[PDB]
Amino acid sequence: SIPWNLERITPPRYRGGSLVEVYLLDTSIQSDHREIEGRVMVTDFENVPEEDASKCDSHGTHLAGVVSGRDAGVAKGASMRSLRVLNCQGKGTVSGTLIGLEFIRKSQLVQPVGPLVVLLPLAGGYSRVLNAACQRLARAGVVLVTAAGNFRDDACLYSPASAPEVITVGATNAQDQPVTLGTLGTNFGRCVDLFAPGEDIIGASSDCSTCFVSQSGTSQAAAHVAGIAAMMLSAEPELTLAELRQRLIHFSAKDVINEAWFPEDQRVLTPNLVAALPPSTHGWQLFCRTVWSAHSGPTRMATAIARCAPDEELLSCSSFSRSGKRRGERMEAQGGKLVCRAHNAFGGEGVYAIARCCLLPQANCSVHTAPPAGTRVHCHHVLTGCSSHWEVEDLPNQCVGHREASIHASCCHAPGLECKVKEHGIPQEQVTVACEEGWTLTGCSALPSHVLGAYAVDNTCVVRSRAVTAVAICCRS
Amino acid sequence: TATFHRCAKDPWRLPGTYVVVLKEETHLSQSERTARRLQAQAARRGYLTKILHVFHGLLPGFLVKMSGDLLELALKLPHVDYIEEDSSVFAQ
């Protein structure tokens, strides 16, 4: 009898949301449906374009039920408030959506409550202004969850999906595969934070006050995550957005999506995570996440930058180009905070900088750099990361680089932190080395025969080449 | 230095309505003044405008219904950061 989706997000060991409020920006909703009646407040805020009743409140009601519905919801307790920014045909405007976002912030200022989660189950093309409003609303301390989009396309081309400082959600089906349906389906790529159930999801139907319907979409996927977030913020109300994002990732099912469904270039960029509720099993833990930059573009002096959230430390930095036309990467300070910067080669199509960002309080981290000598540098403190760059066109707490390259070590003062280094080499398209269960990958790099790049995938270090050696740095309390 | 943006997905564009975004520290009183200055400069040129909304609390600025003919004029108003043409969003 349990819907496939509510079982899927249930963790392998297990035992809400009322202190938290969830705002929904959507169509009108049928607030008297028995799934949600008394749990949702309709604000009667409305800003929608003209067309060009059962059907009018269909989309929204279903999602309100997914978030908070008493029989089929994720966060069966939670309080909701709805704003109407989509018309009866499911259409809205950027301007209207801003006015809605703005309404939420004003409400909050006038009658402050607890943590807020905002579900944005909608998408248009890339919008400078909409991404900015989202960012600003996020910095004011509000959590935003949005749909990746349903176009079987790179989510960075759509807003709010592409909007910085927002949890963006793609959709998977009962077989844990990305939803694809003809030319439509889940969006993907590096602006997608994680996936969640988004096919055949049962919830409240506005046909009648006790009816149910299965609907599919990245909105449905995002709604599961808003619910999960409402529960997470009820248990730990002081969570920052960054702490919350690190928890969603850590508690996700990993390596369960077959990445063959996605275009070749987006596979590496797309996170293989399916959202889940936190376990009854939970003391402090080291959380890290992998952050891909925008592609640097082909300019000769191009740089890609990967940044962490304000309350995270950058513990390592690597890079990747599909061509292998690369001048590597370096950790550089910027507004008193370290960022990961990667350098394109003359004639390269561009490169990605790939950060490892971790929640590490009490860390005092610095960078130790040595110019071309092979080249070596150490923490004279634990080593958490090696990076390397060169300026030429071609070729024990210690980093070693190429004799012609500069080498950079990330060194942290973190008592209570243990790190070890694990090496693996072979004759080869991809070499791989994983931290042991209970350890957190902090750094991933290749020993210096021509490498395309290296990247952390969860707690596995991947090195891609055209006698290659993967090197993983792993830490724990 | 003020720039213009509109949606790359052409069917989703909604010409004739524009979001005028002002620089970060601009005060609500200034946003309002800038909108009126715009309407006035437009009226002198024979153009009707309608100020639909004045933004404050997240971004300063305003939403305006006008002919795109006026964009060169609007980009030169004081305090303007950028202007974006309105566009469509859809339930997902």
């Binding site: 349903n150 979409g217 | 859809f90």
Partner: peptide, 9 residues
């Protein structure tokens, strides 16, 4: 679907 609405159209 145009565009990706109501269950993948």
């Amino acid at each position: 679907x145009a565009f990706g609405x109501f269950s993948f159209a």
